[PDB]
């Protein structure tokens, strides 16, 4: 067999995806939730389960207190991280972790102790022979198939942009806006209070998230859509709660993702995603802006709202000089793009040198990742 | 099933899963050859929980507490929890593993349990 | 009604009971044909839209 | 071993068969509604 397939694990704030190197799709996709029972057991002899990891916690929502180990792209709780990683390796994949290399992804700007802790955990506990850590929005270009473009990756944790020109990435033009999908979920919870529907518990935030994923879209023109919503009731939808109640979403459908383009709704003074992309363009040099305007790439699940590509194209066309043409490239499989390009990274023949060996970790501590990765 | 091939994700996962289930069935049948038992279907036969206890008795080399006698769901949960408690006492790290997961018959959890008992008793 | 017979009322109830069982049988076959047709139509539409 | 016990057994069997029949019928009806609910949007998207 000689060379063995190296598995890739994409960890984000929302979902964890995992799969082998050569596959076109991930093996397994599941939410990154850890659940614990709030009530006390009353019947003798069901069986003991201290914690619920993954889809089992999502099945028994109304009995647990759900918890997220990743906050804004930073691992807040580590024992939960061994819980999800053990459930990934030994349950979803059924593979021995000590006989494969592991590829992992992370945000561009983050504390270095995060990288050191993932390296130490992958080497000391799981006995992985080799590992690598990569930036997500770099892998989006591998998934796209071009070596020149700007990536805006918007996940559940962060929204970061990076430009790459002909394989050279400019580190001073990288911007990391902290707006993401969980803030939009909280804003949707706040604006559903206006109609009278109250959603409070952690088990009910998943219901709010599903409502967000199903009946939301980005308006092309915000004030005109406000006028249309105030005029008639054509743009109203009805959602079915798990217990049989029916709610009427109405106006709010295009008021949740509009906070992406105007962060003053959430109290933040930061610029929107389109102005962040434009500012990341203008932080680069003169000669490469023409190529970067023609290769804007969307990535991440948060950019799956309908009509977001047209809105971004219109806003950037308004900001940019009129003599150039702007095309937003939004593939229909952007949600797994961070995974897909990563798989391509594990199939190249020249990538076998870049792996962090076990001997290098043994002789240099966990700080070797600051020299070997990126 | 049209919904099975609807998405490229789970169809591929079950393509691996069927072969893994065949391999695990052959592996458990060899260790259950000595005792008068056979695993016709991996999901249906382990729902009772007695047969997994017999597997543990063959593999470990020491006797296990005898199962309780009953026909209801509580007895099956009791039998599964006995084997899970014995595995926990053997310092085999099992997480996200509950008796009701085995009794309900989740595919991934049963396969993970068999893979873990293969790896840790080898 | 002052004049009634227990046998006759029981007999009418048996009549209604067999009518219920038969009705539920046409209901079942009815709905099985319906679901098969809808599944096939959805599959064909999905293939051609893809 | 007589006809009356056979009558009682026959009507009891018929009754429980009928009950199982409406249970299966109503479950199938709700599944049918869901499938049609899904298919109609696909036709509109084709247009």
């Amino acid at each position: 067999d000689d060379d063995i397939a190296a598995l890739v694990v994409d960890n984000g704030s929302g979902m964890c995806k995992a799969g082998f190197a050569g596959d076109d799709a991930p093996r397994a996709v599941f939410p990154s939730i850890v659940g614990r029972p709030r009530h006390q057991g009353v019947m003798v002899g069901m069986g003991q389960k201290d914690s619920y990891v993954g889809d089992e916690a999502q099945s028994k929502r109304g009995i647990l207190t759900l918890k997220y180990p990743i906050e804004h792209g930073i691992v807040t709780n580590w024992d939960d991280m061994e819980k999800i990683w053990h459930h990934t390796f030994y349950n979803e994949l059924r593979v021995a972790p000590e006989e494969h290399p592991v590829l992992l992804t992370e945000a561009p700007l983050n504390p270095k102790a995060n990288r050191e802790k993932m390296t130490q955990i992958m080497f000391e506990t799981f006995n992985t022979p080799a590992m690598y850590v990569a930036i997500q929005a770099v892998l989006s270009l591998y998934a796209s198939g071009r070596t020149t473009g700007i990536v805006m990756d918007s996940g559940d944790g962060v929204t970061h942009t990076v430009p790459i020109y002909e394989g050279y990435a400019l580190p001073h033009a990288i911007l990391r806006l902290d707006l993401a999908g969980r803030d939009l979920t909280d804003y949707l919870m706040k604006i559903l209070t206006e109609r009278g529907y109250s959603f409070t518990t952690t088990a009910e935030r998943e219901i709010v998230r599903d409502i967000k994923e199903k009946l939301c879209y980005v308006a092309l023109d915000f004030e005109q859509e406000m006028a249309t919503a105030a005029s008639s009731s054509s743009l109203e939808k009805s959602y079915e709660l798990p217990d049989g109640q029916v709610i009427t979403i109405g106006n709010e459908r295009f008021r949740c993702p509009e906070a992406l383009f105007q962060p003053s709704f959430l109290g933040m003074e930061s610029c929107g995603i389109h102005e962040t992309t434009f500012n990341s363009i203008m932080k680069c040099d003169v000669d490469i802006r023409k190529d970067l305007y023609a290769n804007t790439v969307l990535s991440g699940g948060t950019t799956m709202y309908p009509g977001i590509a047209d809105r971004m194209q219109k806003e950037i066309t308004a900001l940019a000089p009129s003599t150039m043409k702007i095309k937003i490239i939004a593939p229909p499989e952007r949600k797994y793009s961070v995974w897909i390009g990563g798989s391509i990274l594990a199939s190249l023949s020249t990538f076998q040198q870049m792996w962090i060996s076990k001997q290098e970790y043994d002789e240099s501590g966990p700080s070797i990742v600051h020299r070997k990765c990126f | 099933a049209r919904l099975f091939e609807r998405s490229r994700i789970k169809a591929l996962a079950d393509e691996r899963e069927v072969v893994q289930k065949k391999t695990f069935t052959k592996w458990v049948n060899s260790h259950l050859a000595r005792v008068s038992c056979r695993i016709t279907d991996l999901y249906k036969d382990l729902r009772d929980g007695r047969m997994l206890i017999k597997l543990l008795e063959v593999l470990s080399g020491e006797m296990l507490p005898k199962p309780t006698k009953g026909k209801m769901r509580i007895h099956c949960l009791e039998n599964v929890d006995k084997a899970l408690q014995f595995l926990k006492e053997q310092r085999v790290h099992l997480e996200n593993m509950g008796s009701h997961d085995i009794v309900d018959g989740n595919h991934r959890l049963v396969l993970g349990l068999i893979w873990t008992i293969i790896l840790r008793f080898q | 009604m002052a004049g009634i017979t227990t046998i006759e009322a029981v007999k009418r109830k048996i009549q209604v009971l067999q009518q219920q069982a038969d009705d539920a049988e046409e209901r079942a076959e009815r709905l099985q044909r319906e679901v098969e047709g809808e599944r096939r139509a959805r599959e064909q539409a999905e293939a051609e839209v893809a | 071993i007589t006809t009356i016990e056979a009558v009682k057994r026959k009507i009891q069997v018929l009754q429980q068969q009928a009950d199982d029949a409406e249970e299966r019928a109503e479950r199938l009806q709700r599944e049918v509604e869901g499938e049609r609910r899904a298919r109609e949007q696909a036709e509109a998207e084709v247009a």
Partner: peptide
Amino acid sequence: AILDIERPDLMIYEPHFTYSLL
């Protein structure tokens, strides 16, 4: 499976019911 496909840009995991609005 990547090594067979020329373009992962034009790739489908599901119909996705895109472009439903208007």
